[PDB]
Amino acid sequence: RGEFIEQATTQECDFTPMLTGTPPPIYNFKRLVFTNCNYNLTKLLSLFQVSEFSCHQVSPSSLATGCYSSLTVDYFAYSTDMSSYLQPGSAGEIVQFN
Amino acid sequence: QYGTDTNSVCPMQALRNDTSIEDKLDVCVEYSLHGITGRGVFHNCTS
Amino acid sequence: RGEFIEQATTQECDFTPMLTGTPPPIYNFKRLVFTNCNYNLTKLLSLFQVSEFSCHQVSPSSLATGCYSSLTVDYFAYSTDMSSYLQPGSAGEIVQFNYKQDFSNPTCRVLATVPQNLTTITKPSNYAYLTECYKTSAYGKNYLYNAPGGYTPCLSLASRGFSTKYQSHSDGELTTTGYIYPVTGNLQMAFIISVQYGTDTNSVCPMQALRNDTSIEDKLDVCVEYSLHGITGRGVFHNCTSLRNQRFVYDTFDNLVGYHSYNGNYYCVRPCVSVPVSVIYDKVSNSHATL
Amino acid sequence: SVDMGTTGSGNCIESQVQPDFFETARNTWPLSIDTSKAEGVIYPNGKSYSNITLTYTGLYPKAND
Amino acid sequence: TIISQSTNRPIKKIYPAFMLGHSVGNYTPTNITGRYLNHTLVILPDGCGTLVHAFYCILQPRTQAYCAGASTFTSVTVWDTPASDCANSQSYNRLANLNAFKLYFDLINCTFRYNYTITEDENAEWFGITQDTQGVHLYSSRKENVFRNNMFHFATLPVYQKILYYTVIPRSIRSPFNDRKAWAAFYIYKLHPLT
Amino acid sequence: NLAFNKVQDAVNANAMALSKLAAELSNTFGAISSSISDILARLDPPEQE
Numbered sequence: 001r002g003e004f005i006e007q008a009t010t011q012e013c014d015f016t017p018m019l020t021g022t023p024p025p026i027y028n029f030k031r032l033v034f035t036n037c038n039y040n041l042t043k044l045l046s047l048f049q050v051s052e053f054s055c056h057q058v059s060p061s062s063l064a065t066g067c068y069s070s071l072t073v074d075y076f077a078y079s080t081d082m083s084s085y086l087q088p089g090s091a092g093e094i095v096q097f098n
Numbered sequence: 099q100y101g102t103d104t105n106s107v108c109p110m111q112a113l114r115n116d117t118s119i120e121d122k123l124d125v126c127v128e129y130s131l132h133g134i135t136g137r138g139v140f141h142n143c144t145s
Numbered sequence: 146r147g148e149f150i151e152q153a154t155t156q157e158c159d160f161t162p163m164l165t166g167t168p169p170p171i172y173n174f175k176r177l178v179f180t181n182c183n184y185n186l187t188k189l190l191s192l193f194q195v196s197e198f199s200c201h202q203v204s205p206s207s208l209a210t211g212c213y214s215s216l217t218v219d220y221f222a223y224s225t226d227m228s229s230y231l232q233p234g235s236a237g238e239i240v241q242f243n244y245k246q247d248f249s250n251p252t253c254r255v256l257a258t259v260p261q262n263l264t265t266i267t268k269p270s271n272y273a274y275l276t277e278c279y280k281t282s283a284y285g286k287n288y289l290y291n292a293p294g295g296y297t298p299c300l301s302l303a304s305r306g307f308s309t310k311y312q313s314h315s316d317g318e319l320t321t322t323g324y325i326y327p328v329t330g331n332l333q334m335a336f337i338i339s340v341q342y343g344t345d346t347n348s349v350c351p352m353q354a355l356r357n358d359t360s361i362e363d364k365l366d367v368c369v370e371y372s373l374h375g376i377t378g379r380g381v382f383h384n385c386t387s388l389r390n391q392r393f394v395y396d397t398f399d400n401l402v403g404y405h406s407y408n409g410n411y412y413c414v415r416p417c418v419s420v421p422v423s424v425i426y427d428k429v430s431n432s433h434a435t436l
Numbered sequence: 437s438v439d440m441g442t443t444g445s446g447n448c449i450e451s452q453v454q455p456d457f458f459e460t461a462r463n464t465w466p467l468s469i470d471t472s473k474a475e476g477v478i479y480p481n482g483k484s485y486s487n488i489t490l491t492y493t494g495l496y497p498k499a500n501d
Numbered sequence: 502t503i504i505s506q507s508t509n510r511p512i513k514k515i516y517p518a519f520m521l522g523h524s525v526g527n528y529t530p531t532n533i534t535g536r537y538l539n540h541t542l543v544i545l546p547d548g549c550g551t552l553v554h555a556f557y558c559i560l561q562p563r564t565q566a567y568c569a570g571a572s573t574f575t576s577v578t579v580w581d582t583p584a585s586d587c588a589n590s591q592s593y594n595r596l597a598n599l600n601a602f603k604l605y606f607d608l609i610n611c612t613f614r615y616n617y618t619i620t621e622d623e624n625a626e627w628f629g630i631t632q633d634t635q636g637v638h639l640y641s642s643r644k645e646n647v648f649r650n651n652m653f654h655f656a657t658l659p660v661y662q663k664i665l666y667y668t669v670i671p672r673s674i675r676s677p678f679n680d681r682k683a684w685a686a687f688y689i690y691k692l693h694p695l696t
Numbered sequence: 697n698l699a700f701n702k703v704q705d706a707v708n709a710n711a712m713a714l715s716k717l718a719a720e721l722s723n724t725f726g727a728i729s730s731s732i733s734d735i736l737a738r739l740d741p742p743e744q745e
């Protein structure tokens with residue numbers, strides 16, 4: 001089997017707000033929405049030391065090789081030792097109020 | 099989100115223009131057109 | 146229900162290469178394959194401090210009490226804090242260029258820490274892994290990715306060694322880059338275990354499952370649980386008189402119907418409920434009979 | 437490093453390379469794969485089967501190769 | 502007989518030999534292709550058709566005359582002497598081909614060394630080889646019944662690097678002028694993923 | 697005419713069988729997608745099965 005790929009040319013997605021300044025608290029999280037742009041995921045992921053990831057109906061590897069209609073990212077400052085309080089179904093105050 | 103129409107948010111590693119469909123007309127190929135993927139055979143048609 | 150266990154006697158599996166010397170880097174992992182031998186899993190696991198395990202289509206407890214046709218183990222030095230990069234579906238460089246776990250067979254992923262008292266294992270100087278492996282092309286970098294369970298194409302280039310961070314080696318068309326960082330504290334390792342189950346005899350069994358409770362002569366007329374050369378089930382054995390050098394007889398529908406035992410007898414194998422039973426009932430007299 | 441025996445000492449015997457004498461038309465004896473006789477078929481591992489027809493996907497030679 | 506187009510002799514069965522490796526290059530002195538680099542898997546029959554060798558070591562060429570490291574090198578050919586090696590079934594020389602092979606190369610850092618006993622006969626047979634994660638697998642029709650053409654697994658070799666190339670080792674029998682026998686040809690068919 | 701109506705009923709039944717057969721290929725049946733290619737592109741082998 002051969003190959004056939006057609007893609008339009010777009011500009012670069014702006015990730016500078018997330019990579020500059022002080023990240024906000026969890027209750028005041030920052031949201032970014034990207035449409036009609038391209039991103040260099042390798043550059044972004046190299047800047048960080050990942051401790052854990054959990055995906056639903058998708059895989060991180062697929063997010064580096066597939067196209068989508070929209071990309072939304074919410075980010076905030078958070079201590080890793082409180083990871084359990086962000087898990088689906090948690091009964092803590094993080095899910096209730098943050 | 100995945101849209102049935104064109105998907106305009108793509109990584110740079112997937113940015114390519116290997117549109118050599120003219121030479122690959124009579125062959126089963128894997129196509130990736132604006133976020134739409136699959137397998138099929140392309141036949142010259144008028145529309 | 147009774148018991149019926151028949152197992153052959155084999156030698157001990159050789160785990161000495163894994164327990165001696167310096168474990169290799171992730172991109173140069175060592176592979177061991179065991180067939181027709183027995184192992185003492187309790188002794189092996191006691192030597193290590195397990196931090197996490199993840200199994201697919203199998204459980205660690207079952208791996209200590211069951212027989213298999215083959216046992217494959219891949220091991221290498223790996224820091225525990227990079228555990229997320231070994232997870233299925235990761236987008237990091239570890240899966241792309243160092244090691245991709247295969248899921249075509251039941252498998253387990255184990256991370257463990259080597260204790261100080263285990264002096265037979267020697268610490269390496271640094272942890273190492275490859276960051277990229279590509280071929281030069283007109284368009285740009287043509288990356289080469291690891292197949293599941295295979296080695297990286299840049300293995301020969303990586304053998305030259307890395308002395309500094311982001312050091313690159315090239316031999317023309319191929320180019321690779323490596324990353325190193327010192328080992329602090331106790332050594333940490335990784336273990337990728339895979340097993341296969343065969344319809345024939347399974348010659349790889351733990352020592353805890355090595356028994357010869359072949360008292361089938363006294364347990365003929367009773368439903369029993371049998372474990373014969375890795376084949377398990379429930380049934381009733383009937384004395385019978387009876388293709389090739391095989392101890393198991395199967396019907397067209399893959400039902401176990403006949404067995405050849407160590408004693409020399411041949412037994413018919415039937416499920417614990419096999420005899421048809423019908424009841425003739427009369428409502429007027431409230432009487433019943435059996436056919 | 438397993439023991440591979442005594443190291444060789446001496447000279448190697450000369451050989452003459454004449455491919456014309458081996459790949460000529462007179463020494464052509466073709467023999468194709470006959471699927472009716474199941475030539476070149478590797479028996480499946482583990483278990484045997486008797487009086488049955490099964491479909492397998494594995495490594496097999498092409499018919500009439 | 503290939504050496505003499507006139508004489509005709511009854512055909513006898515002969516076993517092949519192979520070298521399998523992961524990378525190939527040139528023989529440096531003569532610039533002749535077909536040199537296996539790093540660890541190489543070698544399968545060699547011996548014992549006048551009663552033994553087969555299998556080892557995985559680095560081949561280091563020797564600079565003696567007509568050997569791999571010399572300028573008079575033409576091919577890697579293994580030979581045997583039927584008068585001495587195959588005089589009788591009781592005094593078969595089991596290391597004749599191995600000794601001949603050691604003259605071309607020095608064997609360095611061999612991981613393993615295996616051998617298998619073959620019963621002498623004149624029946625036709627089949628031989629196969631594959632590779633997967635577990636290692637390199639050998640198949641033969643002499644395992645269960647030599648009068649059926651089905652091949653059965655009999656060995657597994659601990660070679661885990663992916664094998665990309667193989668080369669047939671030519672053989673030449675130094676038979677006396679009296680016998681000058683003829684040898685049966687063998688055919689190689691490639692396997693494919695098929696239903 | 698009832699007898700004339702039964703002819704159209706038979707034709708409609710013949711059409712309905714093929715309509716039922718064709719429409720079932722567009723259902724996801726609870727999966728992330730109705731296309732095998734999308735499943736292979738968006739997921740990894742442990743979760744594709």
Ligand SMILES: *[C@@H]1O[C@H](CO)[C@@H](O[C@@H]2O[C@H](CO)[C@@H](O[C@@H]3O[C@H](CO[C@H]4O[C@H](CO)[C@@H](O)[C@H](O)[C@@H]4O)[C@@H](O)[C@H](O[C@H]4O[C@H](CO)[C@@H](O)[C@H](O)[C@@H]4O)[C@@H]3O)[C@H](O)[C@H]2NC(C)=O)[C@H](O)[C@H]1NC(C)=O
Pocket residue numbers: 439440441442443595613614615616
């Ligand atoms: C079929 O394959 C098998 C297995 O590979 C071969 O068996 C080996 O044969 C070699 C000789 O070719 C043996 O090597 C010799 O072993 C002697 C004793 O070795 C002890 O230690 C080893 C390792 O633990 C044990 O396996 C073994 O049982 C003994 O306990 C040594 O004394 C020999 O050294 C002397 O000879 C060599 C010759 O090269 C000299 O270099 C030395 O200086 C010294 O003079 C030698 O190493 C080997 O041990 C055998 N292994 C086994 C497991 O049996 C068969 O030979 C082979 N059959 C064939 C080819 O026909």
Ligand SMILES: *[C@@H]1O[C@H](CO[C@@H]2O[C@@H](C)[C@@H](O)[C@@H](O)[C@@H]2O)[C@@H](O[C@@H]2O[C@H](CO)[C@@H](O[C@@H]3O[C@H](CO)[C@@H](O)[C@H](O)[C@@H]3O)[C@H](O)[C@H]2NC(C)=O)[C@H](O)[C@H]1NC(C)=O
Pocket residue numbers: 622623624625
């Ligand atoms: C080459 O020749 C040998 C020798 O066989 C003899 O010479 C042939 C020219 C024929 O005339 C043969 O009939 C004659 O015996 C062949 O080996 C022999 O093959 C036959 C084929 O059936 C074997 O017969 C079998 O023998 C066993 C013995 O237990 C029975 O179980 C079987 O039912 C069957 O009869 C015979 O034993 C075998 N002999 C030896 C010593 O191995 C050989 O096959 C032939 N090769 C080819 C490629 O044609």
Ligand SMILES: *[C@@H]1O[C@H](CO)[C@@H](O[C@@H]2O[C@H](CO)[C@@H](O[C@@H]3O[C@H](CO)[C@@H](O)[C@H](O)[C@@H]3O)[C@H](O)[C@H]2NC(C)=O)[C@H](O)[C@H]1NC(C)=O
Pocket residue numbers: 040042043110111
């Ligand atoms: C995504 O981002 C990464 C990181 O910014 C890009 O990789 C980088 O690409 C540049 C330009 O090709 C490389 O610079 C060159 O590096 C070599 C190193 O020897 C040097 O000789 C050259 O003069 C030049 O500076 C850079 O090394 C490289 N970095 C890494 C870590 O690979 C990448 O190209 C981006 N991807 C896309 C698709 O745009």
Ligand SMILES: *[C@@H]1O[C@H](CO)[C@@H](O[C@@H]2O[C@H](CO)[C@@H](O[C@@H]3O[C@H](CO)[C@@H](O)[C@H](O)[C@@H]3O)[C@H](O)[C@H]2NC(C)=O)[C@H](O)[C@H]1NC(C)=O
Pocket residue numbers: 185187188352353
């Ligand atoms: C699997 O390996 C373990 C560990 O090597 C084996 O257990 C050990 O078995 C030995 C021999 O039976 C025990 O030694 C004895 O210990 C007592 C302790 O009081 C002492 O009195 C005796 O003189 C003797 O040395 C050893 O303690 C025991 N260790 C542990 C941790 O239980 C085990 O037997 C092996 N399993 C199989 C199936 O072979």
Ligand SMILES: *[C@@H]1O[C@H](CO)[C@@H](O[C@@H]2O[C@H](CO)[C@@H](O)[C@H](O)[C@H]2NC(C)=O)[C@H](O)[C@H]1NC(C)=O
Pocket residue numbers: 007008009113114115
């Ligand atoms: C692939 O090729 C197409 C067709 O040439 C490119 O589409 C053109 O893009 C340029 C800007 O790069 C526009 O000025 C043209 O109008 C576009 N043409 C059409 C017909 O739409 C497309 O950008 C290329 N994609 C790549 C290089 O990723």
Ligand SMILES: *[C@@H]1O[C@H](CO)[C@@H](O[C@@H]2O[C@H](CO)[C@@H](O)[C@H](O)[C@H]2NC(C)=O)[C@H](O)[C@H]1NC(C)=O
Pocket residue numbers: 152153154355356357407
């Ligand atoms: C269970 O008993 C059988 C039957 O006695 C054992 O099989 C024998 O094993 C010995 C070596 O231990 C061989 O010499 C015999 O030839 C074997 N006999 C047969 C009929 O195969 C078997 O090893 C025992 N299994 C155990 C003790 O785990």
Ligand SMILES: *[C@@H]1O[C@H](CO)[C@@H](O[C@@H]2O[C@H](CO)[C@@H](O)[C@H](O)[C@H]2NC(C)=O)[C@H](O)[C@H]1NC(C)=O
Pocket residue numbers: 526527532533534
């Ligand atoms: C192995 O030897 C062959 C020749 O036997 C080499 O091919 C030569 O390559 C040079 C350099 O590009 C050319 O000038 C010659 O014309 C080539 N000769 C032939 C006959 O094609 C080959 O490069 C060598 N390979 C290695 C890896 O050294």
Ligand SMILES: *[C@@H]1O[C@H](CO)[C@@H](O[C@@H]2O[C@H](CO)[C@@H](O)[C@H](O)[C@H]2NC(C)=O)[C@H](O)[C@H]1NC(C)=O
Pocket residue numbers: 301304305316538539
């Ligand atoms: C496999 O063999 C090749 C060629 O003999 C070796 O490649 C050489 O490696 C040395 C040491 O790193 C380099 O300095 C040479 O330039 C290489 N030569 C060539 C011709 O490529 C390689 O080392 C061997 N592989 C291993 C794992 O030892």
Ligand SMILES: *[C@@H]1O[C@H](CO)[C@@H](O[C@@H]2O[C@H](CO)[C@@H](O)[C@H](O)[C@H]2NC(C)=O)[C@H](O)[C@H]1NC(C)=O
Pocket residue numbers: 559609610
């Ligand atoms: C065969 O293996 C030996 C032992 O592992 C290797 O010898 C080592 O070679 C390295 C690299 O040159 C030296 O620094 C070591 O000191 C050697 N060790 C010993 C104990 O001699 C040898 O390189 C290998 N031979 C090959 C790959 O051809």
Ligand SMILES: CCCCC/C=C/C/C=C/CCCCCCCC(=O)O
Pocket residue numbers: 084085089090091092
């Ligand atoms: C450590 C608390 C121990 C609780 C002991 C007794 C509890 C009685 C009932 C408790 C409900 C379950 C609470 C589980 C909370 C998990 C953490 C979280 O999701 O936030």
Ligand SMILES: CCCCC/C=C/C/C=C/CCCCCCCC(=O)O
Pocket residue numbers: 041044045048050052053060061063064073229230234235236237
């Ligand atoms: C910490 C990085 C934060 C990324 C912020 C924005 C990302 C835009 C899209 C990203 C694709 C998902 C990457 C998930 C990587 C998980 C870790 C791994 O599997 O290697």
Ligand SMILES: *[C@@H]1O[C@H](CO)[C@@H](O)[C@H](O)[C@H]1NC(C)=O
Pocket residue numbers: 530531532
């Ligand atoms: C082999 O090739 C080299 C060039 O790489 C050349 O110098 C040498 O003479 C050649 N040797 C022979 C025997 O042709």
Ligand SMILES: [Zn+2]
Pocket residue numbers: 140141142
């Ligand atoms: Zn067409």
Ligand SMILES: [Zn+2]
Pocket residue numbers: 382383384
């Ligand atoms: Zn009964």
Ligand SMILES: [Zn+2]
Pocket residue numbers: 636637638639654656657658
């Ligand atoms: Zn095998």
